[PDB]
Subunit: 284 residues, 4 copies
C-alpha cells in the first residue's frame, strides 16, 4: 500500500449503496490512490456493490474501524477476535487491502488506571488471532495510536511498536495520526522516527481536525521525518469537516472544525500533495 | 496580577500543612512571583496557615479549581454558585488575588451533544453570581478554556470571550492554556488574539504536559501574540511531571510526561523566562 | 494603501509597453489589489501608458526601486534626492500611490564598518527632502529593511523605525520583507511588533525567494503578529521565480528558486490569501 | 568524530598562547567533546602548545578555515592546494581530526554569474589533491555549504553532495550550517536529508548568529532530520556573540547579535544538548 488516501468521512460515515458511491466517486475526482472505508455496521456493508464501485473508478481501498464496547480487546478479547475477523472478512470481500484504525479497543475507552499487563496480554492474544486471520486473506492489519482521552492502551508510537513486537505477527503495521501525535509525541517527528519501519499508514489531520496547513501541526517536521525514514506507505487525509452534528458525541466534537468539506478536500489534499512533493516522498 | 507563576501541582497533590509549605517554599526557591494553589477539598484547607506562608516567603497566589460533578454549572447552576462562593471565601482568606480554572464545569464533563443555549444560560447566571461574590471579596474570577475531551462548553478563546461578554462583569478574565489551545485554536496565536481584551492569565504547558520547549506548542507564535496584544498578566507553568500514578484517572494521564519535576522546573521555568525576555513580555 | 499585491517581477523587471500590460493584466487575472512596479531606468518608463493600463484593469500601484551607487544616500545625499525626486515624479505621473523599497541605499552597499551617525545624518537629510516632495505629490514614501549582506544601514525593523522617527515625516512608512527578516529579526514576529506604529507594507517572500508556504519563514508567527498589531497595509508577493539568469549577479541568485512563475503565482498568492483569512487580516 | 562542539570564536579567533588557552579551557568548562579551531594566521599557531592544551583538558578538535582570496580554488587551484595542505599539516600537528569550513573558496567570493563547470573542475582538482594529503595525515576533510551572499559555488546540501561524489574521496564529508540552510534549503530539513550519507559535521547556529533556540531556525525539523538519518557526527555551536567590532567587515555583521558570549554559551549549548537528548541524537 502506497500513495495518497482520503477517509470516506469527507463525504459520510454511512456506507449504504448511495454513500459508498458518493465517497468512491468523490475520491476519484480528487485523484486519490486510496479511500479509507469505515466499517461501522458490518451487517449493512454490501461488499459486492462496493467492489463494483472501486473497480469502476479504479480506486484502491483500506478499511478502518473502532471496536465497539462489547468487543474491546482490553476486557473481552474473544469478542474482539470475532468482530475483527468479521470486519476482516468484509474488508477482503470488498477488495480492500488492510484493516486499520482502533482495532484494539475504543475511542471512549477508559478504566481510570494506567494500562495493566493483564490488559496488554488480552490485546496481544486477541490481535495475535485476528492478524493471523488477516494473514490468511492476504490482508495487512493496522494499529492506530490515539490520544490519552480516547484510549488508555496505545497512545504513543513507542507503545504501538512495543505492542506489534509482542504480538510478533509479520503483517501488522503501525498507523499514526498527526492529530493524536500533536498531543502524544514529545515532538511529533519522534513518533514517526520511533515507528520507522513498522509505519505504513498515516492519518494526516490538522490539530483541530480541520484543514491540514491551517493549524498547529508542524508539517515540516512531519514530512521531514517521513522522508528521512523512507516512508512508502499511505498518506490519508482525515478531517471532521463533513461530520454531521449528530456524530458529535462519538467524535467528541462540539462545534464546526472548518468552513466545509469541499474547501478541506480542495486545500487539504493539495497541501498534502504539495508538501509530499517538497520533501520528495515516494521519490525513490 | 502580573508576572511569572508556577502551579503548586509541581510539588503536591493536596494542600495540607506540609504540602502547602513544600509548594510555597519551592515556588519561592525558583523566584516565582505567583503560586497557583488548587482548591479540591475545601474543609481540609488551612487558609490562615497558607496566608502566613505566602507572606513569609514573599509569594503572591491565585487559586484554581475544577467544579465537582454535583456542582457543574451547566446543569446545576445553584450548586455551582454555592461551591464557587465557598471556594472564593477560602481564596480570599489565603490572600489569593483570583479564582480561576474550570470554574464553570468539569474536566470529565460531556453531554453527548453540542452545548445548548439553556446550558449557557445556566453558566451565565451562575458565574455572574459568583463573579459578583468575588468582586465583594476583592478577587478577580477566571474562566479557563479546556479541550473538547474535558468539557463541551468552553473550548476555544472565542467561546470564553463570548461567555465573558454575556456575563458582563468587570472582574472576569479569560484564562488560556497552551496545552488545550494546541488542539482547540486554529493556529494557537489566534486564541490569544481573540481574547486580547480579557486575557489576564496563561497556563504555559507543553503539548504533552511535559516540559515547555520540548513538545509541539509553537512558542514563538504564543509569545509573539502575547507581546503584540500587550499582555500584562500571569504566565503560570503547568506540567504533570510530579503527578503520582494515583492521580492518573483524574488527569487522563497514563504514562510519565517527563523525567521528573526537578528538571521541568529547572528547564521549563527558564525557557518561559528566556522567551519572555526575547519578546519583551514585561518590558 | 490596503490589500493584496504582487511584484511586477513575477513577469518582468522591464517596464516597456509590452512588459507593462503583461504584468498589469497578469496581476488583474489573480485578483490582486496592487501591483508593485519597479523603477530601474526612469527614462524607459512611459507613465502615460502605465496609468491607462492601471485604470482599465482596475489595479492600484506602488513603485519601488533600489538606489544606484552614484546616488547612495549615505555618501551622496544630494544625488539621492535628485534620483528619488525623479522616480517620485514618474510614480505620480503613472498614478502610483507610494515609492518604496531600498530608497536609502543599495543592495550591494557596504562600507566594511558598522553604520556611522554621519551616514544616518546623510540618510535623514536626503529622505526628509524627498519624502516632502513625495507628500506634495500625494505619495507615501517607504523604507524597506534588507539583510546585512545587501546593505549595512537598515537591516532590522528597529533600525527602520528609528530612522523614520528621526526624519519626522507623516508620509514615511516602514516596509518589511520576510526573506530579510528571516535573518535579521530575533524571532520574525519581533520585527513586525517593533514596527507596529509605522508598518504599512510587507514583502511576503519565502526564505529562499521561492514559494510562500514552502520554505523556512514562520508564516504563523508573521500573520499572528500582523493581525495582533492591526496591520492594514499591503501584503505583496515577492519571488525570484521569473528572474532571467542574466539578473543573477544583481540579486545574488545563482540557482533556480522554484518551478516557474505560474506555480508561484497560483500556490503563493493563494497561500497569502488563505493565511490572511485564517488570521482575519482584512476580514 | 562524534559529540558536541563549540567554535573557538566564542572566545577569540586569535590563536596566540593566551587565546588558545582561554578558548580550550573555556570549551572544557562547558563540557564539550570538540572545539573548532580556526586557522587564519598559520605562523602564529604554536601547534605543540595547542596539542598539549587539548590533551591536558581532554578536548578533541577540528580545524576550519576560509580560503584567502589569492588561493580561491575556483580560479587558483594550485594555490588552493598549497594553502589547504599547509593548513592540514598544522591541523594534524595540533592533534585535530579534520579540516572543515569554506575549504573551496571565500566568504566574499562572487563572480557575478552562476557557477560554471570550469569552476567546479578547478574545485574537484584542488580538493581531491588536498583531501588526498589529508588522508596521509589521517584527517578527514570537510566542505561547509554557505549562503548565496558569501559564495556562489556551494550553497545547498545538494551542491555539496554532488561535489563530494565527483571527487570520490572516502575521507571528505559534508558540513552544514543552520544559519546558511535557513536561507538555502527549501525546508531546512531537506538539506540534512540530501546530505545523509556524507553529513558528519553541523554548525548549529541561530538565524541571526545569536543564541540557538531564540531565532528563526526550525530546530525541531533540524533535529528530526538528524535523528531520522542516524547522524553520528559533531554538533558545533557557532555564534558571533563574542566577535569584536573590528571583525565586522569580515563577517558582514554590523550590530550585536546577542547580549554577551557568556549567555550564548550558557543558553545555547544547553538548548543544543537538551534538543539532542529530546531527539536521542547520540545512542
Ligand atoms: O482518529 C481516529 C479516531 O480517533 C480515526 O482514525 C478513527 O480510528 C477512524 O475514523 C476509524 O474508522
Ligand atoms: O488545565 C487544567 C485542567 O484541564 C488546569 O488548568 C485545571 O483547570 C486546574 O489545575 C484546576 O486547579
Ligand atoms: O527585497 C528586495 C531586494 O533585497 C526587493 O524588495 C527590492 O528592494 C525591490 O525589488 C526594489 O525595487
Ligand atoms: O559559517 C561560516 C562562514 O560563514 C563559518 O563556518 C566559517 O567558515 C568559520 O569561521 C570557519 O573558521
Ligand atoms: Mg485517525
Ligand atoms: Mg490548565
Ligand atoms: Mg523585498
Ligand atoms: Mg558555519
Amino acid at each position: 500500500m502506497q500513495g495518497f488516501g482520503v477517509h470516506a468521512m469527507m463525504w459520510s460515515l454511512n456506507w449504504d449503496h448511495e454513500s459508498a458511491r458518493r465517497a468512491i466517486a468523490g475520491a476519484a475526482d480528487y485523484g486519490q490512490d486510496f479511500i479509507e472505508i469505515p466499517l461501522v455496521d458490518l451487517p449493512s456493508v454490501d461488499t459486492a456493490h462496493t467492489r463494483a464501485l472501486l473497480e469502476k473508478y479504479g480506486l484502491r481501498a483500506a478499511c478502518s474501524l473502532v471496536l465497539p464496547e462489547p468487543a474491546w480487546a482490553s476486557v473481552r478479547p474473544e469478542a474482539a477476535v470475532a468482530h475483527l475477523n468479521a470486519a476482516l472478512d468484509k474488508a477482503a470481500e470488498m477488495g480492500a487491502e488492510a484493516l486499520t484504525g482502533v482495532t484494539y479497543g475504543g475511542t471512549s475507552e477508559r478504566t481510570g488506571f494506567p494500562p495493566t499487563q493483564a490488559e496488554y496480554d488480552n490485546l496481544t492474544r486477541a490481535l495475535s488471532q485476528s492478524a493471523g486471520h488477516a494473514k490468511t486473506l492476504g490482508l495487512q492489519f493496522g494499529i492506530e495510536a490515539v490520544n490519552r482521552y480516547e484510549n488508555h492502551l496505545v497512545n504513543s508510537a513507542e507503545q504501538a511498536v512495543a505492542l506489534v513486537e509482542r504480538i510478533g505477527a509479520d503483517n501488522i503495521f503501525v498507523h499514526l495520526d498527526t492529530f493524536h501525535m500533536n498531543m502524544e509525541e514529545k515532538g511529533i517527528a519522534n513518533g514517526i522516527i520511533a515507528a520507522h519501519d513498522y509505519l505504513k499508514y498515516m492519518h494526516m489531520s490538522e490539530s483541530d481536525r480541520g484543514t491540514p496547513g491551517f493549524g498547529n501541526v508542524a508539517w515540516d517536521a512531519v514530512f521531514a521525518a517521513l522522508a528521512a525514514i523512507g516512508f512508502k506507505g499511505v498518506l490519508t487525509l482525515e478531517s471532521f469537516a463533513a461530520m454531521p452534528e449528530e456524530m458529535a458525541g462519538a467524535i467528541s466534537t462540539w462545534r464546526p472544525v472548518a468552513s466545509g468539506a469541499d474547501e478541506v478536500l480542495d486545500k487539504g489534499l493539495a497541501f498534502l500533495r504539495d508538501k509530499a512533493s517538497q520533501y520528495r516522498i515516494f521519490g525513490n
